[PDB]
């Protein structure tokens, strides 16, 4: 009823600090919002499919969005970064009990996100190296 | 193998930072942290299993290197680098700690400023902030370094070398070289004190310092002569003061040629307008440590110098804005007069009175004619308000040379001011804006009430017209001021223990009220809000005033205790700056000095004058020992001498001075009292601290104290020396080791471990209240009382806000603090301290 | 001035003395403040004017400032300290009789604009009280509720309701040491602490630090307690008061700790920075009174002490060192003592109320460490809090910035989840179920619009049986 409501707080304030996404300086020198990623972490332990699945939705916006502008670009690749390494603990700190509850979700909501960074990628020489190498990981 | 290559690593790199600029440099700083803190655990662990702990000259040569490149990194303009140095600090501090564990005198003999590092830590644990609000920072700390070393003497010469390059390219040569320049500038003037003792380096920057406040250059030479006044008024070291007195006033000597005619050059008027500015700023705040170098140098003939220059510029919107300034110098000048030292003071305050009196001129805008001459009016303001505080306690003096008499030149002199005073208040009636007028006419007011009050004799008959003035609120300023002089009889007439003795007699109860629990409330407010720059007159106030109603204790138990228990340090506190060393220092030399004449005065008659110690040495050191000399000899006429002094010291415990009982007794009590609220004894704390405080000092340099006449012959100077060490540790009840000079004497040390407790037993086993021994002689101390008086007064508002957050439980309706402030407005405003005699001295 | 200089009179030199500094005190700015003319640098200029044979003044400035009862007891006082210094050096002087006199047959009836300053003045100069004057007070207080509700004029009657209340603080000291009313005024002063009004409340608690003091130079508490002294004293008139119970939402007879300190919560809202300091000090005289009792050290955790020492949590230094949380003597929060579901969760709902009002860095990061170790200590009965923490928590999850006050609340969230997913034992109705669904309203914010909770018809009822009660005639 209500704590449902506090981890979408915890959920969303992890969209709006995405460098894509503007920075006001709520980082506060990256104190604040890298407390606001351990809790999101901790949280996942106990709400696996909720947080999980709003990981995906997160990432599918950033992905299929529009910029110009070198600079924009370093924040769309810089973003991305950050959200797959979240990501990954989520799925790698689960308790090992063969939680194998999550059936709908995969098939069309998260792998068709993650393949697209396997696919070789000329857009950069070093850029694309990185994330493969990061979604590779989560896959 | 480990201390000696490590060091040597050390060596090679703390050589390079201080070489030149580099981009990495902030890196290295931090990778150079972190090989200190390695260092330090390898010495604990080292230290536990073996003391052994090698010191190679490669060791000490390196420890060395290394603080001059911790100070150099003070003034990087980075932001990042100063605050990681300054962290750095505190590594050092405790690498003297693991090689020593007796902070009493090891800790602060390997480190001598062991106190100011501990405090640059603090600081760097402070939120971020600007370049500016941070170099204010390390500044106020530089300032308090005392001792000079290696470390200090060194990177002042260093630093110097790049600062005095930097100028010729800035200068000879036709913004981020300026900021660095700006630095250096700040850390030189900060840290001056140390290098201090013709010639000298130091001299030598004061010489360039003097030369850019008159920099005329086309592209930066604005913000040189900026900056320069900012840093020197604001930011020199306080010990600097004297060397910089004297040389602004070598420098505006020359601007009077023979017979005394001025010389406007249009850079003498841009010199002697900085020198003002300067002069207002080092005069106008308080620095903690200035208050025995303020008052070391005269600075009247530079003052009379000044406005005898500007008395010559004439009338323009220029020349009259630097009168203003100068007018508003002197009034600050007036204010720190009990800090100042003055050869002839009633000759300098009537000398100035005549000058400023001339600029008063009123009407000279409406002559004027013009719209921007508005200036002329704040000139009046000014120059009044100057003559009000020159006139305040002033008797008149007819500069002499003139057949007039005495008392018939003084009449004539009083005339003079009074009809001019007169003049300028008929030209303020409301008839003949209306803000302007009325500060003016309320000073005018004012220096005559001022000119009377100090010249009733010379000058009644001149006034008494004042009655019947047009103006009815000048008639009842004047109808107050001769009923001030009807209180105050003509002479002494011996009415001060009669008319007086009973007008303060509440002030005093007072401040003595026993605070429930015994907190004295009034005496611990009083301690807070006080400034430091007059905590040198606190103590003196306090110890007299409370002594005197024999309760000495009770104002020390309040004292020492909170320190104590705040602070670990115990008993080593009390040997920094702060209001509770300063009562320790003021008893110690005004009840205690009695004491040692009458011990050491005999005895150092004999080693010095007679016969028998005609041809002695005490020189028992192998390596300076010289071919003639003999050991043995040299040894047992020491050993001889420790008897005569150790055995006196033991039998005067009768004669020791009651002042002082009381202060090791509190020692005693609130040391005691510190173990039981945490095999250490309390009476070994006391009496060592009272040897090393109070004795040693005297026995070590005993012409400096005033015991002797004239300074000891080499010879007897090094026996002194080295019978201290033998006197210290048989207090400190310790043995001789590592040092095999002294190692013979360590039975004659052990023998005596008993016969000094029993010493110390006797001065520190007085009653915590001394209700066996009691007196009541009750001194009157008007002289005293009248410094209190002055004191309460000028504090007023912050006292009243202190006592009111307290004495929750039980409002302040009728608590100590509603008690000042009705008998403060019963008394009255304080006095005027009277003109000073002397040259300025100290306790 | 014409005291000192009198010849008629013959005061000794020490009487002359207090004169003489009475005389400076009455000129200092704070006498001006309490006499209304502040910013007057002169009282005489203003009095006299030059040209009064010539025209007629014009008055100005038609805004005057309001005068408060409480000025009017330190010029009351002050003038009864002079007149009491010159009757010692004058023989049988009847200057105090005659004074008392006068101030009777103004307090006893009915009049708008000199009752209510009469009353204050009775009061202060009086040496004697009977039962039958002070039940006429009681009596006033009773009707000045009734008139206050039943028509707009309030602000006429609230004065009449304060100045009986000041009275009756000055009064109690001199009553009968055997008489039954120094408990029946307890009642009183809680009754005054229920009509949410700054100015009523502020004179309430005055009625009450004095009435537990009185209480215990006669040593009423020596083998007893203060709930039982007070809750003895109100069971003949049980009936009336357990209708006031239901309408505030603090139940009495279920905890009686808990309902008063209920009370005393509001206390730290009050505007004026010397009423909220003595709060603090009834709470530490409460807390001494209910352990020497049970001889409990005066800072042991029980059953009884709990609610006090969650209010002293914020204030005092002392409570935060001797009751320190578990997971850094004893410990607050206790699972081997605080058994009761019912006491464990009155003590919640304190230190959510607590946060909820608070504005203060300092205080909110000392009370959300507890709230967070609390979580994982009770998670049973934690639910029956979420409401009073879920607004202001959303909030400090999005915005705040500050690591000191952000790992506390994160503590909570990752402890709710974890214990989600049983059926809910307990709701957030469970306090209704015994009484204490008014605790986290009454401790609000005083309101501005001063309207009495028009409950007040019960509190007339329960004043006009008190009476009857105990002052039969
Ligand atoms: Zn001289």
Same mark, same amino acid.
């Given at each position: 009823?209500?704590?449902?409501?506090?981890?979408?707080?915890?959920?969303?304030?992890?969209?709006?600090?995405?460098?894509?996404?503007?920075?006001?300086?709520?980082?506060?020198?990256?104190?604040?919002?890298?407390?606001?990623?351990?809790?999101?972490?901790?949280?996942?332990?106990?709400?696996?499919?909720?947080?999980?699945?709003?990981?995906?939705?997160?990432?599918?916006?950033?992905?299929?969005?529009?910029?110009?502008?070198?600079?924009?670009?370093?924040?769309?690749?810089?973003?991305?970064?950050?959200?797959?390494?979240?990501?990954?603990?989520?799925?790698?700190?689960?308790?090992?009990?063969?939680?194998?509850?999550?059936?709908?979700?995969?098939?069309?909501?998260?792998?068709?996100?993650?393949?697209?960074?396997?696919?070789?990628?000329?857009?950069?020489?070093?850029?694309?190296?990185?994330?493969?190498?990061?979604?590779?990981?989560?896959? | 193998?480990?201390?000696?290559?490590?060091?040597?690593?050390?060596?090679?790199?703390?050589?390079?930072?201080?070489?030149?600029?580099?981009?990495?440099?902030?890196?290295?700083?931090?990778?150079?942290?972190?090989?200190?803190?390695?260092?330090?655990?390898?010495?604990?662990?080292?230290?536990?299993?073996?003391?052994?702990?090698?010191?190679?000259?490669?060791?000490?040569?390196?420890?060395?290197?290394?603080?001059?490149?911790?100070?150099?990194?003070?003034?990087?303009?980075?932001?990042?680098?100063?605050?990681?140095?300054?962290?750095?600090?505190?590594?050092?501090?405790?690498?003297?700690?693991?090689?020593?564990?007796?902070?009493?005198?090891?800790?602060?003999?390997?480190?001598?400023?062991?106190?100011?590092?501990?405090?640059?830590?603090?600081?760097?644990?402070?939120?971020?902030?600007?370049?500016?609000?941070?170099?204010?920072?390390?500044?106020?700390?530089?300032?308090?370094?005392?001792?000079?070393?290696?470390?200090?003497?060194?990177?002042?010469?260093?630093?110097?070398?790049?600062?005095?390059?930097?100028?010729?390219?800035?200068?000879?040569?036709?913004?981020?070289?300026?900021?660095?320049?700006?630095?250096?500038?700040?850390?030189?003037?900060?840290?001056?004190?140390?290098?201090?003792?013709?010639?000298?380096?130091?001299?030598?920057?004061?010489?360039?310092?003097?030369?850019?406040?008159?920099?005329?250059?086309?592209?930066?030479?604005?913000?040189?002569?900026?900056?320069?006044?900012?840093?020197?008024?604001?930011?020199?070291?306080?010990?600097?003061?004297?060397?910089?007195?004297?040389?602004?006033?070598?420098?505006?000597?020359?601007?009077?040629?023979?017979?005394?005619?001025?010389?406007?050059?249009?850079?003498?008027?841009?010199?002697?307008?900085?020198?003002?500015?300067?002069?207002?700023?080092?005069?106008?705040?308080?620095?903690?440590?200035?208050?025995?170098?303020?008052?070391?140098?005269?600075?009247?003939?530079?003052?009379?110098?000044?406005?005898?220059?500007?008395?010559?510029?004439?009338?323009?919107?220029?020349?009259?804005?630097?009168?203003?300034?100068?007018?508003?110098?002197?009034?600050?000048?007036?204010?720190?007069?009990?800090?100042?030292?003055?050869?002839?003071?009633?000759?300098?305050?009537?000398?100035?009175?005549?000058?400023?009196?001339?600029?008063?001129?009123?009407?000279?805008?409406?002559?004027?004619?013009?719209?921007?001459?508005?200036?002329?009016?704040?000139?009046?303001?000014?120059?009044?308000?100057?003559?009000?505080?020159?006139?305040?306690?002033?008797?008149?003096?007819?500069?002499?040379?003139?057949?007039?008499?005495?008392?018939?030149?003084?009449?004539?002199?009083?005339?003079?001011?009074?009809?001019?005073?007169?003049?300028?208040?008929?030209?303020?009636?409301?008839?003949?804006?209306?803000?302007?007028?009325?500060?003016?006419?309320?000073?005018?007011?004012?220096?005559?009430?001022?000119?009377?009050?100090?010249?009733?004799?010379?000058?009644?008959?001149?006034?008494?017209?004042?009655?019947?003035?047009?103006?009815?609120?000048?008639?009842?300023?004047?109808?107050?001021?001769?009923?001030?002089?009807?209180?105050?009889?003509?002479?002494?007439?011996?009415?001060?223990?009669?008319?007086?003795?009973?007008?303060?007699?509440?002030?005093?109860?007072?401040?003595?009220?026993?605070?429930?629990?015994?907190?004295?409330?009034?005496?611990?407010?009083?301690?807070?809000?006080?400034?430091?720059?007059?905590?040198?007159?606190?103590?003196?106030?306090?110890?007299?005033?409370?002594?005197?109603?024999?309760?000495?204790?009770?104002?020390?138990?309040?004292?020492?205790?909170?320190?104590?228990?705040?602070?670990?340090?115990?008993?080593?506190?009390?040997?920094?700056?702060?209001?509770?060393?300063?009562?320790?220092?003021?008893?110690?030399?005004?009840?205690?000095?009695?004491?040692?004449?009458?011990?050491?005065?005999?005895?150092?008659?004999?080693?010095?004058?007679?016969?028998?110690?005609?041809?002695?040495?005490?020189?028992?050191?192998?390596?300076?020992?010289?071919?003639?000399?003999?050991?043995?000899?040299?040894?047992?006429?020491?050993?001889?001498?420790?008897?005569?002094?150790?055995?006196?010291?033991?039998?005067?415990?009768?004669?020791?001075?009651?002042?002082?009982? &009381?202060?090791?007794?509190?020692?005693?009590?609130?040391?005691? *009292?510190? %173990? /039981?609220?945490?095999? =250490?004894?309390? +009476? $070994?704390?006391?009496?060592?601290?009272?040897?090393?405080?109070?004795?040693?000092?005297?026995?070590?340099?005993?012409?400096?104290?005033?015991?002797?006449?004239?300074?000891?012959?080499?010879?007897?100077?090094?026996?002194?020396?080295?019978?201290?060490?033998?006197?210290?540790?048989?207090?400190?009840?310790?043995?001789?080791?590592?040092?095999?000079?002294?190692?013979?004497?360590?039975?004659?040390?052990?023998?005596?471990?008993?016969?000094?407790?029993?010493?110390?037993?006797?001065?520190?086993?007085?009653?915590?209240?001394?209700?066996?021994?009691?007196?009541?002689? &009750?001194?009157?101390?008007?002289?005293?009382?009248?410094?209190? *008086?002055? %004191? /309460?007064?000028?504090? =007023?508002?912050? +006292? $009243?806000?202190?006592?009111?957050?307290?004495?929750?439980?039980?409002?302040?309706?009728?608590?100590?603090?509603?008690?000042?402030?009705?008998?403060?407005?019963?008394?009255?405003?304080?006095?005027?301290?009277?003109?000073?005699?002397?040259?300025?001295?100290?306790? | 001035?014409?005291?000192?200089?009198?010849?008629?009179?013959?005061?000794?030199?020490?009487?002359?003395?207090?004169?003489?500094?009475?005389?400076?005190?009455?000129?200092?700015?704070?006498?001006?403040?309490?006499?209304?003319?502040?910013?007057?640098?002169?009282?005489?200029?203003?009095?006299?004017?030059?040209?009064?044979?010539?025209?007629?003044?014009?008055?100005?400035?038609?805004?005057?400032?309001?005068?408060?009862?409480?000025?009017?007891?330190?010029?009351?006082?002050?003038?009864?300290?002079?007149?009491?210094?010159?009757?010692?050096?004058?023989?049988?002087?009847?200057?105090?009789?005659?004074?008392?006199?006068?101030?009777?047959?103004?307090?006893?009836?009915?009049?708008?604009?000199?009752?209510?300053?009469?009353?204050?003045?009775?009061?202060?100069?009086?040496?004697?009280?009977?039962?039958?004057?002070?039940?006429?007070?009681?009596?006033?207080?009773?009707?000045?509720?009734?008139?206050?509700?039943?028509?707009?004029?309030?602000?006429?009657?609230?004065?009449?309701?304060?100045?009986?209340?000041?009275?009756?603080?000055?009064?109690?000291?001199?009553?009968?040491?055997?008489?039954?009313?120094?408990?029946?005024?307890?009642?009183?002063?809680?009754?005054?602490?229920?009509?949410?009004?700054?100015?009523?409340?502020?004179?309430?608690?005055?009625?009450?630090?004095?009435?537990?003091?009185?209480?215990?130079?006669?040593?009423?508490?020596?083998?007893?307690?203060?709930?039982?002294?007070?809750?003895?004293?109100?069971?003949?008139?049980?009936?009336?008061?357990?209708?006031?119970?239901?309408?505030?939402?603090?139940?009495?007879?279920?905890?009686?700790?808990?309902?008063?300190?209920?009370?005393?919560?509001?206390?730290?809202?009050?505007?004026?920075?010397?009423?909220?300091?003595?709060?603090?000090?009834?709470?530490?005289?409460?807390?001494?009174?209910?352990?020497?009792?049970?001889?409990?050290?005066?800072?042991?955790?029980?059953?009884?002490?709990?609610?006090?020492?969650?209010?002293?949590?914020?204030?005092?230094?002392?409570?935060?060192?001797?009751?320190?949380?578990?997971?850094?003597?004893?410990?607050?929060?206790?699972?081997?003592?605080?058994?009761?579901?019912?006491?464990?969760?009155?003590?919640?709902?304190?230190?959510?109320?607590?946060?909820?009002?608070?504005?203060?860095?300092?205080?909110?990061?000392?009370?959300?460490?507890?709230?967070?170790?609390?979580?994982?200590?009770?998670?049973?009965?934690?639910?029956?809090?979420?409401?009073?923490?879920?607004?202001?928590?959303?909030?400090?999850?999005?915005?705040?910035?500050?690591?000191?006050?952000?790992?506390?609340?994160?503590?909570?969230?990752?402890?709710?989840?974890?214990?989600?997913?049983?059926?809910?034992?307990?709701?957030?109705?469970?306090?209704?179920?015994?009484?204490?669904?008014?605790?986290?309203?009454?401790?609000?914010?005083?309101?501005?619009?001063?309207?009495?909770?028009?409950?007040?018809?019960?509190?007339?009822?329960?004043?006009?049986?008190?009476?009857?009660?105990?002052?039969?005639?």
């Amino acid at each position: 009823h209500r704590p449902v409501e506090w981890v979408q707080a915890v959920v969303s304030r992890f969209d709006e600090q995405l460098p894509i996404k503007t920075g006001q300086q709520n980082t506060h020198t990256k104190v604040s919002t890298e407390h606001n990623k351990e809790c999101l972490i901790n949280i996942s332990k106990y709400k696996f499919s909720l947080v999980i699945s709003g990981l995906t939705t997160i990432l599918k916006n950033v992905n299929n969005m529009r910029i110009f502008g070198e600079a924009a670009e370093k924040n769309l690749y810089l973003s991305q970064l950050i959200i797959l390494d979240t990501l990954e603990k989520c799925l790698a700190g689960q308790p090992k009990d063969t939680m194998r509850l999550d059936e709908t979700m995969l098939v069309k909501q998260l792998l068709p996100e993650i393949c697209h960074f396997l696919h070789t990628c000329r857009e950069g020489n070093q850029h694309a190296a990185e994330l493969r190498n990061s979604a590779s990981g989560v896959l | 193998t480990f201390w000696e290559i490590s060091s040597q690593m050390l060596f090679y790199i703390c050589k390079k930072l201080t070489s030149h600029q580099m981009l990495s440099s902030t890196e290295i700083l931090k990778w150079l942290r972190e090989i200190l803190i390695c260092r330090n655990k390898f010495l604990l662990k080292n230290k536990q299993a073996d003391r052994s702990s090698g010191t190679p000259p490669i060791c000490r040569q390196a420890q060395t290197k290394l603080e001059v490149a911790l100070y150099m990194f003070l003034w990087n303009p980075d932001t990042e680098a100063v605050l990681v140095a300054m962290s750095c600090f505190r590594h050092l501090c405790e690498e003297a700690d693991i090689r020593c564990g007796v902070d009493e005198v090891s800790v602060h003999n390997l480190l001598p400023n062991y106190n100011t590092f501990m405090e640059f830590a603090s600081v760097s644990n402070m939120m971020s902030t600007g370049r500016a609000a941070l170099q204010k920072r390390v500044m106020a700390l530089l300032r308090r370094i005392e001792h000079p070393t290696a470390g200090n003497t060194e990177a002042w010469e260093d630093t110097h070398a790049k600062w005095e390059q930097a100028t010729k390219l800035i200068l000879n040569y036709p913004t981020d070289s300026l900021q660095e320049w700006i630095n250096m500038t700040g850390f030189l003037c900060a840290l001056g004190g140390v290098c201090l003792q013709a010639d000298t380096p130091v001299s030598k920057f004061m010489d360039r310092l003097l030369s850019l406040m008159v920099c005329n250059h086309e592209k930066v030479g604005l913000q040189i002569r900026t900056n320069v006044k900012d840093l020197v008024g604001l930011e020199l070291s306080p010990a600097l003061y004297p060397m910089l007195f004297n040389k602004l006033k070598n420098t505006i000597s020359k601007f009077f040629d023979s017979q005394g005619q001025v010389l406007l050059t249009d850079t003498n008027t841009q010199f002697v307008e900085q020198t003002i500015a300067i002069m207002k700023n080092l005069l106008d705040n308080h620095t903690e440590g200035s208050s025995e170098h303020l008052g070391q140098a005269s600075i009247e003939t530079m003052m009379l110098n000044l406005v005898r220059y500007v008395r010559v510029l004439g009338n323009m919107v220029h020349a009259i804005q630097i009168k203003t300034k100068l007018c508003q110098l002197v009034e600050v000048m007036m204010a720190r007069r009990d800090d100042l030292s003055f050869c002839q003071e009633m000759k300098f305050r009537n000398k100035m009175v005549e000058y400023l009196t001339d600029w008063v001129m009123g009407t000279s805008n409406q002559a004027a004619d013009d719209d921007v001459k508005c200036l002329t009016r704040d000139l009046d303001q000014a120059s009044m308000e100057a003559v009000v505080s020159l006139l305040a306690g002033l008797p008149l003096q007819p500069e002499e040379g003139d057949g007039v008499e005495l008392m018939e030149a003084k009449s004539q002199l009083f005339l003079k001011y009074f009809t001019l005073f007169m003049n300028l208040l008929n030209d303020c009636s409301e008839v003949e804006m209306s803000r302007r007028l009325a500060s003016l006419r309320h000073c005018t007011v004012l220096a005559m009430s001022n000119l009377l009050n100090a010249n009733v004799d010379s000058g009644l008959m001149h006034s008494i017209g004042l009655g019947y003035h047009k103006d009815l609120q000048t008639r009842a300023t004047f109808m107050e001021v001769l009923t001030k002089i009807l209180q105050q009889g003509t002479e002494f007439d011996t009415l001060a223990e009669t008319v007086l003795a009973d007008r303060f007699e509440r002030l005093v109860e007072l401040v003595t009220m026993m605070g429930d629990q015994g907190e004295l409330p009034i005496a611990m407010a009083l301690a807070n809000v006080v400034p430091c720059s007059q905590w040198d007159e606190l103590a003196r106030v306090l110890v007299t005033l409370f002594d005197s109603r024999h309760l000495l204790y009770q104002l020390l138990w309040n004292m020492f205790s909170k320190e104590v228990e705040l602070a670990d340090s115990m008993q080593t506190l009390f040997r920094g700056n702060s209001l509770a060393s300063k009562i320790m220092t003021f008893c110690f030399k005004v009840y205690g000095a009695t004491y040692l004449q009458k011990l050491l005065d005999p005895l150092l008659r004999i080693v010095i004058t007679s016969s028998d110690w005609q041809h002695v040495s005490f020189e028992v050191d192998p390596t300076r020992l010289e071919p003639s000399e003999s050991l043995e000899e040299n040894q047992r006429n020491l050993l001889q001498m420790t008897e005569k002094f150790f055995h006196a010291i033991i039998s005067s415990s009768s004669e020791f001075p009651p002042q002082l009982r &009381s202060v090791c007794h509190c020692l005693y009590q609130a040391t005691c *009292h510190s %173990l /039981l609220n945490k095999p =250490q004894n309390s +009476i $070994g704390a006391v009496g060592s601290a009272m040897f090393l405080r109070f004795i040693n000092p005297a026995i070590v340099s005993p012409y400096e104290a005033g015991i002797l006449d004239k300074k000891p012959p080499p010879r007897i100077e090094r026996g002194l020396k080295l019978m201290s060490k033998i006197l210290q540790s048989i207090a400190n009840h310790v043995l001789f080791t590592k040092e095999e000079h002294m190692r013979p004497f360590n039975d004659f040390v052990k023998s005596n471990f008993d016969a000094a407790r029993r010493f110390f037993l006797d001065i520190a086993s007085d009653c915590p209240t001394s209700d066996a021994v009691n007196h009541s002689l &009750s001194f009157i101390s008007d002289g005293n009382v009248l410094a209190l *008086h002055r %004191l /309460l007064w000028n504090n =007023q508002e912050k +006292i $009243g806000q202190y006592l009111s957050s307290n004495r929750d439980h039980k409002a302040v309706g009728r608590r100590p603090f509603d008690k000042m402030a009705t008998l403060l407005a019963y008394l009255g405003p304080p006095e005027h301290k009277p003109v000073a005699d002397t040259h300025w001295s100290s306790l | 001035h014409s005291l000192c200089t009198c010849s008629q009179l013959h005061f000794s030199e020490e009487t002359k003395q207090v004169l003489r500094l009475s005389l400076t005190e009455f000129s200092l700015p704070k006498f001006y403040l309490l006499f209304g003319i502040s910013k007057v640098k002169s009282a005489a200029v203003i009095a006299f004017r030059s040209s009064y044979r010539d025209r007629s003044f014009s008055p100005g400035s038609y805004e005057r400032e309001t005068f408060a009862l409480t000025s009017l007891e330190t010029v009351t006082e002050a003038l009864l300290e002079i007149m009491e210094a010159c009757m010692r050096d004058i023989p049988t002087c009847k200057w105090l009789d005659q004074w008392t006199e006068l101030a009777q047959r103004f307090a006893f009836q009915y009049n708008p604009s000199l009752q209510p300053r009469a009353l204050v003045v009775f009061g202060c100069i009086s040496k004697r009280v009977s039962h039958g004057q002070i039940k006429q007070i009681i009596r006033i207080l009773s009707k000045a509720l009734e008139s206050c509700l039943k028509g707009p004029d309030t602000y006429n009657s609230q004065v009449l309701i304060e100045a009986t209340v000041i009275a009756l603080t000055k009064l109690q000291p001199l009553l009968n040491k055997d008489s039954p009313l120094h408990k029946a005024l307890f009642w009183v002063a809680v009754a005054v602490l229920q009509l949410d009004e700054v100015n009523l409340y502020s004179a309430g608690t005055a009625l009450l630090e004095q009435n537990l003091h009185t209480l215990d130079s006669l040593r009423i508490f020596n083998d007893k307690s203060p709930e039982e002294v007070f809750m003895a004293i109100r069971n003949p008139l049980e009936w009336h008061c357990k209708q006031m119970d239901h309408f505030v939402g603090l139940n009495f007879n279920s905890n009686f700790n808990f309902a008063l300190v209920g009370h005393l919560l509001k206390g730290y809202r009050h505007p004026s920075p010397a009423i909220v300091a003595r709060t603090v000090r009834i709470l530490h005289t409460l807390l001494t009174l209910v352990n020497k009792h049970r001889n409990c050290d005066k800072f042991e955790v029980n059953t009884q002490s709990v609610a006090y020492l969650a209010a002293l949590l914020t204030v005092s230094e002392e409570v935060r060192s001797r009751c320190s949380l578990k997971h850094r003597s004893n410990v607050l929060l206790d699972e081997e003592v605080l058994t009761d579901p019912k006491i464990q969760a009155l003590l919640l709902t304190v230190l959510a109320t607590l946060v909820k009002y608070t504005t203060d860095e300092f205080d909110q990061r000392i009370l959300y460490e507890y709230l967070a170790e609390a979580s994982v200590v009770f998670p049973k009965v934690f639910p029956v809090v979420h409401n009073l923490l879920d607004s202001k928590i959303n909030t400090l999850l999005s915005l705040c910035q500050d690591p000191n006050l952000l790992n506390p609340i994160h503590g909570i969230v990752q402890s709710v989840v974890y214990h989600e997913e049983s059926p809910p034992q307990y709701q957030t109705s469970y306090l209704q179920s015994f009484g204490f669904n008014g605790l986290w309203r009454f401790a609000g914010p005083f309101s501005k619009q001063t309207q009495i909770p028009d409950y007040a018809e019960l509190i007339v009822k329960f004043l006009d049986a008190l009476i009857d009660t105990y002052l039969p005639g």
